[PDB]
Design a protein around this ligand. Structure first.
Ligand code: H35
Ligand code: H35
Lengths: 262, 267
């Protein structure tokens, strides 16, 4: 009887600690990605001529990789509307490519080609981030809301690891104060994004912890309560505990669930 | 009764430990973002040809990112200038290196650390030799010799006279060897990225928003020297409960310094 009580208390403690650790690391990453969005705005748009380039972005992001613990890499995609495509591709000496096959993009109203990338995600360069549905939806919500947004869990490029993408908007100085959504769209310069590689880096975070073999941990995206999506853990459908997670995007909801094996 | 007294201590422990965690975490976040600024100056001012950082750019970026550094009133970048170079440096900048105590032209020194970039919140630092204050000077030396973020003892900051501490990071030239000796670090020093932890104002602001703040008295001490504890935050001597206290752990990240928090009831 006393033993059941102690067992419950240990589960709550273990689960709550893991949830705090994960929320905190996510939070630190989001904050540092916000700083990068501000850096691109200040150095690429506010300065004339631009005082940021791929070499500099690669260096800075490499040297600050420690500031973004759950992220496999960061990249900056620029907003390009179709009338500007020819000039853009001539300036960059490359063609805007599709994410799925790396083929030259068919005509679209607009694109979000990656122009700067951390070398860890170098394969993103020139890819149109609107040619992937999760990234596209993220890009639109980022620019319309003015804030960091997260995707549902999905399998990331190259590694195929299950993760979530974080996108921040970057705006031109023409953005009015207290802007409408329409004003936000018009003033959009691009999108600073990062991949939370949950499958690998959350596993590295949690798997090293004492007691890991005694409990089963899942993280769910419960944005749609009738359709919970696994973000971390196995696909399995008594004694559990739900620990709170808040990853900072009001559009999404998450939770951690822990159980004992036996 | 004896039940209520046990619970009274339990609440003090919880309140004090939570406040200590908050202080430690917020300082850690600030230190990490100062580290990123040091890397920014290295990458964008030194490595990039030409430099992308002038005073206007530094002021803008630091203002827009001030939320990243919650326990800091301002940040600035001081460049290492040896005396051989002083006249050249002053001619290029069209200003003279000044002392921090009176803003007067600096006397001849072997070297200087004049502020060349500043967040507007600490704009009065521009052109001041940060080696002309003892706390800042010792911090600069330990920063460059160790390669890590360092903290001063508590002292009254320039202009505000608020009781605080200074955080200083070294910035090195690309000539810094792998696995450098201290002598190599000194030779490769470019300058120093510093930030003012205005403990008196900003820790009061942090604590005063918390529920139960009126019930508790919070002090923070620098206990680097056991026999000479130094007040970092708090009063005396205040109307405080002498019968019960709690000590909460604090670690601000510099192994050269030690700190602790003590809470008591107002009662
Ligand atoms: C700009 C907008 O969104 C991004 C990051 N998206 C992203 N990064 C890394 N791997 C990915 N795989 C799919 N989408 C990915 C950069
Ligand atoms: C470079 C080296 O150290 C600094 C920060 N020092 C500092 N900042 C703001 N107020 C001060 N008052 C004394 N020292 C101060 C900048």
């Amino acid at each position: 009887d006393a033993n059941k009580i102690r067992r419950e208390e240990v589960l709550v403690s273990m689960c709550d600690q893991r949830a705090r650790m994960l929320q905190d690391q996510f939070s630190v990453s989001v904050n540092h990605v916000h700083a990068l969005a501000i850096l691109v705005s200040t150095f690429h748009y506010h300065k004339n001529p631009s005082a940021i380039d791929q070499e500099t972005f690669a260096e800075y992001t490499a040297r600050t990789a420690f500031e973004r613990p759950l992220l496999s890499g960061v990249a900056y995609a620029e907003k390009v509307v179709n009338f500007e495509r020819e000039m853009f591709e001539r300036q960059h000496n490359w063609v805007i490519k599709t994410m799925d096959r790396g083929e030259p993009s068919p005509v679209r109203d607009e694109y979000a080609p990656v122009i700067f990338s951390q070398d860890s995600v170098s394969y993103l360069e020139s890819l149109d981030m609107m040619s992937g549905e999760e990234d596209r939806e993220n890009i639109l919500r980022a620019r319309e809301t003015g804030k960091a947004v997260l995707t549902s869990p999905f399998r990331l490029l190259e590694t195929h690891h299950l993760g979530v993408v974080l996108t921040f908007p970057v705006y031109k100085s023409s953005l009015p104060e207290n802007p409408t959504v329409e004003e936000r769209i018009a003033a959009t310069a691009g999108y600073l994004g990062g991949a939370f590689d949950v499958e690998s880096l959350v596993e590295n975070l949690l798997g090293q912890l004492a007691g890991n073999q005694a409990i089963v941990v899942h993280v769910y995206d419960i944005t749609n309560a009738s359709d919970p999506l696994v973000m971390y853990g196995n696909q399995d459908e008594s004694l559990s505990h739900e620990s709170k997670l808040d990853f900072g995007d009001p559009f999404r909801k998450h939770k951690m669930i822990c159980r004992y094996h036996q």
